Amino acid sequence: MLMPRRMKYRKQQRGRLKGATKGGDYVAFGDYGLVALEPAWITAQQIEAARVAMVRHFRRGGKIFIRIFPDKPYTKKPLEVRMGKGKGNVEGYVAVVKPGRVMFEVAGVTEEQAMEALRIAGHKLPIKTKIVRRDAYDEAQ
Amino acid sequence: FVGTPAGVRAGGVLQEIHRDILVKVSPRNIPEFIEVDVSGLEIGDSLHASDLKLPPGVELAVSPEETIAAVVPPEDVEKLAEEAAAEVAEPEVIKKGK
Amino acid sequence: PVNNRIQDLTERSDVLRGYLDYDAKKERLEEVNAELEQPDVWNEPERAQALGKERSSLEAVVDTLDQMKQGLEDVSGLLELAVEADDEETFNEAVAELDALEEKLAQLEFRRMFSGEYDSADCYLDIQAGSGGTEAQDWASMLERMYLRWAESRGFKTEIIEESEGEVAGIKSVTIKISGDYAYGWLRTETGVHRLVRKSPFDSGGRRHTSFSSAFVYPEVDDDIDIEINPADLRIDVYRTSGAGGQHVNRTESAVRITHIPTGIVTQCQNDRSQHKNKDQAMKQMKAKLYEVEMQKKNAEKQAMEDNKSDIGWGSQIRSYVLDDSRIKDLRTGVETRNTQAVLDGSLDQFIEASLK
RNA sequence: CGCCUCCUAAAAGGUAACGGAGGCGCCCAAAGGUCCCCUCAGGCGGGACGGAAAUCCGCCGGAGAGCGCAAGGGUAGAAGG
RNA sequence: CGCGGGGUGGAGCAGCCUGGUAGCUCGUCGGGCUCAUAACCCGAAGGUCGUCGGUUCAAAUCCGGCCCCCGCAACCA
RNA sequence: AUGUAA
Ligand SMILES: [Mg+2]
Ligand SMILES: [Mg+2]
Ligand SMILES: [Mg+2]
Ligand SMILES: [Mg+2]
Ligand SMILES: [Mg+2]
Ligand SMILES: [Mg+2]
Ligand SMILES: [Mg+2]
Ligand SMILES: [Mg+2]
Ligand SMILES: [Mg+2]
Ligand SMILES: [Mg+2]
Ligand SMILES: [Mg+2]
Ligand SMILES: [Mg+2]
Ligand SMILES: [Mg+2]
Ligand SMILES: [Mg+2]
Ligand SMILES: [Mg+2]
Ligand SMILES: [Mg+2]
Ligand SMILES: [Mg+2]
Ligand SMILES: [Mg+2]
Ligand SMILES: [Mg+2]
Ligand SMILES: [Mg+2]
Ligand SMILES: [Mg+2]
Ligand SMILES: [Mg+2]
Ligand SMILES: [Mg+2]
Ligand SMILES: [Mg+2]
Ligand SMILES: [Mg+2]
């Protein structure tokens, strides 16, 4: 699954999940979108589970767009160690997501399919989500 | 986008890069559409703003290189197994210092 | 030459009616049609399967050899009606529907190749010396090079995997990778001990001398190394360590035991003070015990090969290449070609195709 | 375990953790002073040996080169040659 | 992520620390001696230096990350 | 040093 091919630094401070999305809040490619309703770190394994969920549903046809990327390394100390002795090892990669982010989009598919595919994908995600459709408002952005 | 693309019949999906186009024009002259013949597009093919036939009195305000449509391959479950067994080379950290 | 390319279709169909028993299938197909006609045949729909698809399995045999004996007779009158009239369309129309019956016949001849699950795997060929001595290690080398020229003809890959050249002169063992299409199907009917009778160049007083060698053929299955183990059938037990340690060994369940439910294999650990530094070990050792057992299945299968092949010895031939009176009898079937030094060059088609029955 | 650079450090300074990353224990008799002159990296085109890259020619170029070595700041209206 | 030692032609090993040449033994290929083989003699071929990322004009060699490998350590309750 | 097996 998804992870940066290379990076300047191995490990990152944790930071914060304050505020609405910086950007990425309007439909930009497909006809329908799955938008994040709550702040979270989305794991690469979640993204892929959401991805595979849609393509399994569409079965053949349609196109999925993934608008989030896991570039944030995740750290965990080896189990049953004590505090101290430095920062834990990189165990995976996550995407920071805030309320209003359009995470996925689909196109080339019927409304019924897009609603259904995006619903299941949401069930693979650790946050509440919303299915949306392309608007004058989006195109106007 | 007028026409049903040949690519779509062969299993593809028409990705509409621009759903509108930027143009210089007079208010007395505001068009409702610009038709585009997409029926010629196969899977892997694209249209640009150069293939846009402009109605009279309407002037392109973007580069003719600006691409406006494409017919792309569809999603395929048959591809999923390959995706899962795809092994990744671990991320490279760019060398700092000496 | 076209009236000779229908004569080869007459020979290929008679050999197809001989081994397939044209009479024991024209008769068996008639008893299936007598049971399925009754509407009261769907009483146990399991039985109707093995007869309705068997009737289609005998109508792909009996009815195909009926449309080959009649279809070729209608071509023996269509090629002489275009010659005595200078009609050049009646002669393009008596070969088009002649090369389609040559595919109906070639397809039904793949009842010889479709008899072995997976008969296209890039098989290997193992020739071993034995019997005869130095004479047979020479004989094993001649039999080695013969199969190489065989694969050179029909279009395969000849990558020698493992050799062992003989002490004096010759070859003790060879392993060849016959990478190709239908590769195992062709060389499958070579598994046996080939017998050589001739004047040995190694015998002091140049006597007539018998030497044997074997060729064993298996298809290609892959690595099949490690097998996945989910914790849904593992049952990890926890308890307190035993022996020295002090208080922190009396009130601590630091020892683990991982019992695999389907296999029945148990394994414990108690080395380190941590329950999971021990559970790490117990997964490790547990992987090891399953790797042993899944190995013991295959080594048991290996001995099944050893114990069912055998033995590069005297009363154990399948073919006898005797170079002192120019014959090669394949005492299995059995052809009697007199071109000894042409078979040693690789003309085994004479044997392979005839011995796939 | 002392010293230097960046971040953590919350737009002055300062600010901890067995927090995230690197370097120093030298070197230069010129790699110093002062006058005078010069301007790079890279890309495109052309060109004997000759190449992705030797030197040459042309055009494009505000600095992304260079400044002995880590990093940062600085810098061609030189601190670089 | 315990400390420290390694991975180089087919096999076993040198060459690293002081950066620009990869060398030794066996094996292997060709030719000899022999009726024939071994031994012996003459001649030859042969190596991404475990990888991924670059430092330097230049890395088997210097510096990190990962992968296996050998040794030590894992104590007081 | 060695040379099986009619
Ligand atoms: Mg935006
Ligand atoms: Mg989490
Ligand atoms: Mg810590
Ligand atoms: Mg959800
Ligand atoms: Mg924008
Ligand atoms: Mg042997
Ligand atoms: Mg003689
Ligand atoms: Mg004690
Ligand atoms: Mg306790
Ligand atoms: Mg002090
Ligand atoms: Mg900074
Ligand atoms: Mg400050
Ligand atoms: Mg303070
Ligand atoms: Mg240091
Ligand atoms: Mg000096
Ligand atoms: Mg200086
Ligand atoms: Mg001076
Ligand atoms: Mg040039
Ligand atoms: Mg050049
Ligand atoms: Mg040049
Ligand atoms: Mg600079
Ligand atoms: Mg070198
Ligand atoms: Mg020799
Ligand atoms: Mg390394
Ligand atoms: Mg002996």
Q: What is the DSSP letter of C333?
A: T
Q: Does A52 touch chain B (CB under 8 A)?
A: yes
Q: What is the largest CA-CA distance in chain C?
A: 112
Distance CA C349, CA C153 (A): 10
Q: What DSSP assignment string belongs to C169-218?
A: SSEEEEEEEEESTTHHHHHGGG-EEEEEEEE-TTSTT--EEEEEEEEEEE
Contact residues for B98 (Cβ-Cβ < 8 A; gap 6+):
none
Is there a contact between B77 and A7 if contact means CB atoms under 8 Å apart?
no
Give the CA-to-C1' distance from A132 to D31 in angstroms. 67
Domain assignments of chain A as residue spans, ordered by start: 29-137
Q: Does A79 touch chain C (CB under 8 A)?
A: yes
Contact residues for A85 (Cβ-Cβ < 8 A; gap 6+):
none
The two structure tokens encoding residue A61? 């046809």
Distance CA A56, CA B76 (A): 8
Give the CA-to-C1' distance from A71 to D16 in angstroms. 29
Q: Compute, in angstroms, the gap from residue C207 CA to the centroid of ligand 23.
A: 29
Least CB–CB distance from A63: residue in B74, B80, B96: B74
Distance CA C185, CA A54 (A): 43
- Peptide bond between residue B11 and the one before it cis (omega within 30 degrees of 0): no
Give yes or no for CB of B19 within 7 Å of strand D: no
Strand pairing report for B46-48 and B13-15: unpaired
Beta-carbon pairs below 8 A across chains A and B: 64
Method: X-ray
Q: Does C302 touch chain A (CB under 8 A)?
A: no
Strand pairing report for C192-199 and C319-322: parallel
**For chain C, where are the alpha helices, taking DSSP H only?**
2-5, 7-19, 22-26, 28-36, 45-58, 96-99, 101-109, 134-154, 183-187, 247-250, 275-308, 340-343, 349-352
3-state secondary structure C317-331: CCEEEECCCCEEECC
Q: What is the DSSP letter of A88?
A: P
Residues A29-137: name the CATH superfamily: Ribosomal protein L16/L10 (3.90.1170.10)
Q: What DSSP assignment string belongs to chain B?
A: -BS--HHHHTT-EEE-S-SS--EE--GGG--S----B-TT--TT-EEEGGG--PPTT-EE-S-TT-EEEEEEPPPBGGGHHHHHS---PPPEEPP---
Which of helix, strand or coil describes residue A105? strand
Residue of chain C whose alpha carbon sits nearest to that of A79: C276
Please count the CA atoms within 13 angstroms of the CA of A30 that sit on its side-chain side: 27
Distance CA A33, CA B13 (A): 17
Measured in whole angstroms, how far is the alpha carbon of residue C68 from the centre of its chain?
29
Residue of chain B whose alpha carbon sits nearest to that of A52: B80
Give the CA-to-C1' distance from C354 to D49 in angstroms. 67
A80, A81, A82: best mutation site toward chain C, by most C Cβ within 10 Å? Answer: A80
Contact (CB, 8 A) for A51 and A64: yes
Q: Give strand pairing partners of A89.
A: A76
The two structure tokens encoding residue C345? 């060059």
Q: Does A49 touch chain B (CB under 8 A)?
A: no
Query: Which nucleotide in the DNA or RNA is closest to residue C201, CA to C1'?
Result: E36
Give yes or no for CB of A10 within 7 Å of strand D: yes
Q: Compute, in angstroms, the gap from residue A84 CA to the centroid of ligand 15.
A: 47
Q: Compute, in angstroms, the gap from residue A28 CA to the centroid of ligand 1.
A: 10
Q: Give strand pairing partners of C237.
A: C257
First to last CA, chain B: 57
Is there a contact between B20 and A139 if contact means CB atoms under 8 Å apart?
yes
Residue of chain A whose alpha carbon sits nearest to that of C280: A79
For C206: left if phi > 0, alpha if psi spans -120 to 50, otherwise beta; the answer is left
Q: Does A136 touch chain C (CB under 8 A)?
A: no
Rounded to 5 degrees, φ, ψ at C164 are -155, 100
Q: Compute, in angstroms, the gap from residue C209 CA to the centroid of ligand 7.
A: 15
Distance CA C62, CA C20 (A): 9
Resolution of the PDB structure in angstroms: 3.3
Is there a contact between A62 and B14 if contact means CB atoms under 8 Å apart?
no
Contact residues for A29 (Cβ-Cβ < 8 A; gap 6+):
A65, A67, A105, A107, B15
